[PDB]
Design a binder for this molecule. Structure first.
Ligand SMILES: *[C@@H]1O[C@H](CO)[C@@H](O)[C@H](O)[C@H]1NC(C)=O
Ligand SMILES: [Ca+2]
Ligand SMILES: [Cl-]
Length: 496
């Protein structure tokens, strides 16, 4: 459960948030494979409630109606087509599995679902699965409202409704089997793993009973005995009775303290500085590296819908965001996930973005195709952060330095720091309000190296900054606090 099952030498996955299957298939072939991305986290592929008020919000996909592979992203054939084409090019697919609940208890019965399946939340009837009143935790929850009212009670956090979402009785073998049937269908199609949505709201033991029913990965693409990669979404900042460590026996866990603290450090909130990142990782009270799935922002908290709240860096904060993602991709801790978003009309009223529910670019509800501009950026309001040179090049940087120790750390006691990864890579950052000009020990072999943040090594030459490393591994770096990207990264393969 702990290994991503990526191809040897590919170290990151991208969340192509709300993308259609056909666009992901194309992207696997035209960009992800050539650029060395290990895999893709896709949005929930099962049928969900179609919510028209507000108009098709992104969160309607977290309210299941059935396990039919029928959504705004595409149908079952298109889903299969995408998994096959991506796998055939070495890029894995990870499914967002929404298995803790069905839709809101207050949603109207009818056939307002993405595949036209009938459902009746009021009577707990989801015939397309099928599920009935017996498969929900209505009689097990002990709160007066039936919803989760207090997180200091670990029992109600698991048995009651997360803001009204009907809660599946996961201790029942029937329910566990319906979920396993769904996941095995996906494993046999070829997916490499799952993000278990809302894991904090499920008992570690019920999750394990479900995982025990899962198949090994498809032997047509994976070695025999391969187990699906499992990463559980557990928001564990401090102070709650539920700890992410309680889920280690099941697979990896999302480490939300990662992006939260990186954001405050990079924003320099409340006295924090980059020099403090010297012992970043377990030293900061994070989970062990081999159990961590890290990221700067995720689909929830990039729109204020989650852990970290205000300090979270997102594409809207482009200059600082690139620096944070760069630090994440160069640091040895955890398995990294890169975010890929869409633009929405933020609209802050009293500090709250009243448009945080806006769904993906669409024409009358039909999600728009990702179009590629001549300069490789995307059109139709897809931000495509994974295509930004500074990010794409750092994805490759991680691949190149995979396995190398963290060494040659330097910091000016403020916000100018640098470190290397063995003798395969080196990165320098200037987040101070003055310039950086110093000769540092890089641990790299003598030569001329292309800085992959400002440019690329394109046919024997660098299109941006060049660094010259002398025989003793020393090199001079100059970064003014006015640079569009206040950081420089060089590695074995950008060497001229
Ligand atoms: C690097 O570019 C310069 C021209 O701008 C040229 O003199 C040189 O041939 C180039 N090297 C290669 C390998 O293309
Ligand atoms: Ca639950
Ligand atoms: Cl997540």
């Amino acid at each position: 459960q702990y290994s991503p099952n990526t191809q040897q030498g590919r170290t990151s996955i991208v969340h192509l948030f709300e993308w259609r299957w056909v666009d992901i298939a194309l992207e696997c072939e035209r960009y992800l494979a050539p650029k060395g991305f290990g895999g893709v986290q896709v949005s929930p592929p099962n049928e969900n409630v179609a919510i028209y008020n507000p108009f098709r919000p992104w969160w309607e996909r977290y309210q299941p109606v059935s396990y039919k592979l029928c959504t705004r992203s595409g149908n079952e054939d298109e889903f299969r087509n995408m998994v096959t084409r991506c796998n055939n090019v070495g890029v894995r697919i990870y499914v967002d599995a929404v298995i803790n609940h069905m839709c809101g208890n207050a949603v109207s019965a009818g056939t307002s679902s993405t595949c036209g399946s009938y459902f009746n939340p009021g009577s707990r009837d989801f015939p397309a699965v099928p599920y009935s009143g017996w498969d929900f935790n209505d009689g097990k929850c002990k709160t007066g409202s039936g919803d989760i009212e207090n997180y200091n009670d670990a029992t109600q956090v698991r048995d009651c409704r997360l803001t009204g979402l009907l809660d599946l009785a996961l201790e029942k073998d029937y329910v566990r089997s319906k979920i396993a049937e769904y996941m095995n269908h996906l494993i046999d199609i070829g997916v490499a793993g799952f993000r278990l949505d809302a894991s904090k709201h499920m008992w570690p033991g019920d999750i394990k009973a479900i995982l025990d029913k899962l198949h090994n990965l498809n032997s047509n693409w994976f070695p025999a005995g391969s187990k699906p990669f499992i990463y559980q979404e557990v928001i564990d900042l401090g102070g709650e009775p539920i700890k992410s460590s309680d889920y280690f026996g099941n697979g990896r866990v999302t480490e939300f303290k990662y992006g939260a603290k990186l954001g405050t450090v990079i924003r320099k909130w409340n006295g924090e500085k980059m020099s403090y990142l010297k012992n970043w990782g377990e030293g900061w009270g994070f989970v062990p590296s081999d159990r961590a799935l890290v990221f700067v922002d995720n689909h929830d908290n990039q729109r204020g819908h989650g852990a970290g709240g205000a300090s979270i860096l997102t594409f809207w904060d482009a200059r600082l965001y690139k620096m944070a993602v760069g630090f994440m991709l160069a640091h040895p801790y955890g398995f990294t996930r890169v975010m890929s978003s869409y633009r929405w009309p933020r609209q802050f009223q009293n500090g709250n973005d009243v448009n945080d529910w806006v769904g993906p670019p669409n024409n009358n509800g039909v999600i728009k195709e990702v179009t590629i501009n001549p300069d490789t950026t995307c059109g139709n309001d897809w931000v495509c952060e994974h295509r930004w040179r500074q990010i794409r090049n750092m994805v490759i940087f991680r691949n190149v330095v995979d396995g190398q120790p963290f060494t040659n750390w330097y910091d000016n006691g403020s916000n100018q720091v640098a470190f290397g990864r063995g003798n395969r890579g080196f990165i320098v950052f200037n987040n101070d309000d003055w310039s950086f000009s110093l000769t540092l020990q890089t641990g790299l072999p003598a030569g001329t190296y292309c800085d992959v943040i400002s440019g690329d090594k394109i046919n024997g030459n660098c299109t941006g900054i060049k660094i010259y490393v002398s025989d003793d591994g020393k090199a001079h770096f100059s970064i003014s606090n006015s640079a569009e990207d206040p950081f420089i990264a060089i590695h074995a393969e950008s060497k001229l």
